[PDB]
Every structure is written in C-alpha cells, then in structure tokens.
Amino acid sequence: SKRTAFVMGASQGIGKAIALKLADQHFSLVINSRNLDNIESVKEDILAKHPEASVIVLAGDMSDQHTRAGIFQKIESQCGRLDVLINNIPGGAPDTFDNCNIEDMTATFTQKTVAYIDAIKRASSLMKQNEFGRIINIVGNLWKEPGANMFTNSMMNAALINASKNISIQLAPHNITVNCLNPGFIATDRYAEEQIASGIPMKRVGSAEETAALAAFLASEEASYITGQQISADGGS
C-alpha cells in the first residue's frame, strides 16, 4: 500500500535520518520540529532527492498537549489516515539523585513520557481505522548508576518501556505493532578527549542511518508479527 508516516522532531539527527530512509521507501511523510525553518530545509532536501514526494511540514512542540491535538487533527484532515508513528522527543536535562529536583521531574515526565502516550492515543484511533499501524518509540537506556547523570530520564525510560509493553498488547488485535527503539550515541552535545568509545563492545558509536534502518524495518509490512519489543542499536550495553 501507500502508507503515511508521521516523524516528529525530524529537523535533524535521528528523526531526520528516519525521515529520509522512510522517504527512500516511498512513504507519505508528515514531518515536525519546533523550528519551522530547519524543518522546511528537510522537506527541500527530500523533494530534491525525490521530486514526487508527499512531504507535509507541521512545525510545533510535540511536548505541548494542545500542539499535539492540533497536529493530529491536521494529519487526519490532510491525510485521512496514519500508518506509522515515530515518537521522538528528547528527555529532560541530566540530573542526579543528589542534584535532582521535583519541579523539573514532573516537567520531564510530562515533556516526554506523557507526550508519547497521548501521541499514541491519537495515532492509534487514526490507525485503528485501517486495522493497521506501526508505532516506534525512540527511547534510551536505563538503569545503571547515573552515574551518567541520567537519573530522571532513566526512570522515565523504564516507565515508557513498561507502558509500551502494555499498549502493545492492547493494540495488537488491531494490527498495530508497538516497539521501542533505543539508540546509543549519535549527534547531541554532551561535554581526542573522548574514550567513551571504550566501554562499547563494537568500539564505535551509532549512526542515525543504522538507527533509521531499524526503524524503517519495524515500520514495514513484514514486521507485522513483531510487537511489544525492545531493541537497541547501541553496539552493546
């Protein structure tokens, strides 16, 4: 069939990569980031490689409850369907059990975790219309001694893993797979001078294309019996 895919936070990085690969495979695209100008540029990049592409740009903050409803309202309007959802929202800033505070925790929780779930709620009832869907969640790693300053994000990642398992079960009947994809390392700040490459088995860091090759597959028709899964493109824990 000729599917429609909504890829969020795709102005660059992992989302941008998933966008191109998904375009590479003749998916109809609806794309999003906060920055209207950065996102436009991607559409131009995609149309350039593929002139006939159906790319839609809906700038906005997917962390915002209302921006969400509006985006989904639009897609339902301009597309009439939705097959694939790519939940891709960054977690909060790094923190420590010592350094953490509770105002921000709630924020972060709301910013990513709730966002993803609401987004699935909307995607799903759209998806349910055609008894088909592919939900891929960009999530990251737990558990282990943040330590990596990822205290709040790790507990969020856990909650998200749990929730997806649940959701996957509730939505399977409807031919909608729900899987989490945890990349490891790509393009995102942080602070020679860099032997983190030493600690990863493959001894290298991820690439958005590698991550995107995976998400593309999960998005495909042949991936119809794969749900409730948790798969890392991390080269090793």
Add this chain to the structure above:
Amino acid sequence: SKRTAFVMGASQGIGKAIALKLADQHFSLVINSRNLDNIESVKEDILAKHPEASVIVLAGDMSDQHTRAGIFQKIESQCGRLDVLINNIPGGAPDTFDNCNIEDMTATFTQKTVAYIDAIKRASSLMKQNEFGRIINIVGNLWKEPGANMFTNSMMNAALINASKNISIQLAPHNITVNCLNPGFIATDRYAEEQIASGIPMKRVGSAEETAALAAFLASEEASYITGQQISADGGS
C-alpha cells in the same frame, strides 16, 4: 544499637503490620497516616503490647511536598537520627491505556513516585549522619496487560524500580541499603465470587505479616550487604 524507624501510611494494612513487627523488635517508632485518630489507635495498640515503646505519631499526607519536609524536620528534631525508612504510599486509581487521562497521570506520578524519592532524599541525609540506613520501598507489580487496569501504576512501579537501583548505588558507600518490596494481595477494596486465588502459584493471598516479616529482615543489621534488590512476597507472579 537502638534504631529509629519511620513507617508511613501505617494506620492499617501493610504499614500497620510492619509497625507492629518493627515494634516487636524494639525499634523506636515514628508512625504516620492521614487519619490522626486511626493512627493514634495503633500507638495505643503498640504501647499496650509493649508498655515501654517509643512511638511517635505524625499525622499527615506524605504525598504532600510540604507535609513531607515538615515530618522530616520533626523526626530530625525529636529523634536526632533515622535508620530505617518505609516508603509506603498507595498508587493512583486504576486506569487503562484507553481510559487513562494525562491530568491524573501527572498527579499519580507526583503522588507516589516523586513522594518516595523526596522522602529518600530527606531520610538519606539524616541516615548519612550515622553511616547507616535501611530504605525499603513498598512497590507492586508490573508489567503485564493492565488488563488489570493498572496502566499508570505499572509504569510508575517500573520508574520506581529503576530509580531505586540507581539510588542504591549512590548510597551504598554510606551503608544505606535500598530495596523494593512488592507484596501481592492483602487488605484493599477492589470489586465465593473470587477465583483470583486461581492464578497465583501458592494458591493463597499474601498476609501483611508475611510482607512485614520480610521488611523487618531487610531493616535489620544482618541485611547490610543486600541492596538494590527487588523481592516479591507474592507467592508467584
């Protein structure tokens, strides 16, 4: 030594059970629930079995950020120390991925998860003073198709498991164990007419004493090398 233990939501049920067993072992007790009258009655029950008991009643809502700080301020004042913490706060109301809503999710998150963590923050710096502590977290079961209407509570339980692991690592250096205790079934509403006993391996439902025997042990001196653990008194998953 002569330790001091703070057991929250101990007006009855599991917390009440932990309170008596801990009293049974000559811990100095600080106890809490929302209901001043229900909690008082426990003190009377404890003093009655043990006349010499040091029981302190601090009524209050441990879900409340400010009530929390105040309770800990008091304990630090009237006790000068704290050895054992019993994080015992009920989760939110049951919900479904379908039926759930996001206002309540945030609430629930704040009500239990954040509560426990803040409570540990306060307990710990108190505990750090004597290079000794025992943090037991009353948590429950994930993951599996709520289904049991436990959608939001399951993802919260997951986040809590993750966070404790982390915290356990950060606090071990200070001789403070952090373990989660997941009971299964005890005294708490729900809606013959009841073959849930069929689905549990032991074919029976938990008892607060069983749960309390465990928490008491984790609270003991001999349990000094047991941290970051996850242990069910559920008779079987």
